Design a protein around this ligand. Structure first.
Ligand SMILES: Nc1ccc(-c2cnn([C@H](CC3CC3)c3ccc(-c4c(-n5cnnn5)ccc(Cl)c4F)c[n+]3[O-])c2)c(F)n1
Length: 236
């Protein structure tokens, strides 16, 4: 996260850090708890991933340095990638992780609701992107989970900034005209979380952008509301 600030323990309890363990253990992507056995993340995350065997899902993590050889994690039983996914910038950047067992929810590990039936025309004005990613284009994974408030932009404006890509209704963009706050490397797969009537909704999945936090280049997110039928089909 560029231009963000540190979170405190318990602040974003649906946020997970997905680790790979091949050839060595490192943070791979963010993700969001959407069910006791279900993480929603980005399909792009699994580009180099030989199978679910090498994944570890950590929840309830504030600092990456909390994770040690005895820190508990959830195994991944299945990676469900959208059948039309080809590359992040062309959409369908969405994946479900089915965990081997059910998260018992606690103060530090909680679900975020999907965008609700009948909210298709809500204007979300309280949206935040979170993650352990770079604070700038050439940087490092951050120890403490970072947060930044970022405004949504219309798909019409977004398309005008990305005339070499097809910005569709299955994408949602977010950023400041002047730049300065955005996701960056290591944030993808995590949530774009928007609060409406004091309830958090998983509005976007952090996906791609041109640089990080550049002027007039909003970040691009998977528009979760357009995949609700797909999520329900896969999780049922
Ligand atoms: N050590 C270390 C080093 C690198 C990485 C690493 C590298 N890229 N990525 C991902 C894609 C990889 C996981 C498949 C990625 C891609 C794009 C974005 C992104 C951007 N950016 C534009 N230019 N950069 N970012 C802007 C806006 C939005 Cl909205 C974005 F989503 C975020 N991420 O995370 C993870 C790492 F994870 N660890």
């Amino acid at each position: 996260i560029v231009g963000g600030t540190a979170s405190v323990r318990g602040e974003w309890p649906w946020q997970v850090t997905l680790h790979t363990t091949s050839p060595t253990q490192r943070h791979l992507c963010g993700g969001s708890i959407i069910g006791n056995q279900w993480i929603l993340t980005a399909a792009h995350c699994f580009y180099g991933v030989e199978s679910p065997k090498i994944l570890r899902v950590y929840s309830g993590i504030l600092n990456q340095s909390e994770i040690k050889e005895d820190t508990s994690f959830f195994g991944v039983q299945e990676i469900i990638i959208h059948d039309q996914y080809k590359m992040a910038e062309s959409g369908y950047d969405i994946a479900l992780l089915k965990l081997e067992t059910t998260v018992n929810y606690t103060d530090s590990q909680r679900p975020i609701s999907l965008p609700s039936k009948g909210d298709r025309n809500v204007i979300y004005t309280d949206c935040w992107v979170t993650g352990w990613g770079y604070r700038k284009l050439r940087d490092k994974i951050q120890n403490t989970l970072q947060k930044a408030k970022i405004p949504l932009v219309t798909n019409e404006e977004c398309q005008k900034r990305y005339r070499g890509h097809k910005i569709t209704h299955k994408m949602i963009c977010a950023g400041y005209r002047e730049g300065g706050k955005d996701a960056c490397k290591g944030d993808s797969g995590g949530p774009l979380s928007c609060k409406h009537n004091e309830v958090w909704h998983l509005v976007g999945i952090t996906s791609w952008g041109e640089g990080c936090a550049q002027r007039e280049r909003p970040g691009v997110y998977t528009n979760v509301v357009e995949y609700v039928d797909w999520i329900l089909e896969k999780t049922q």
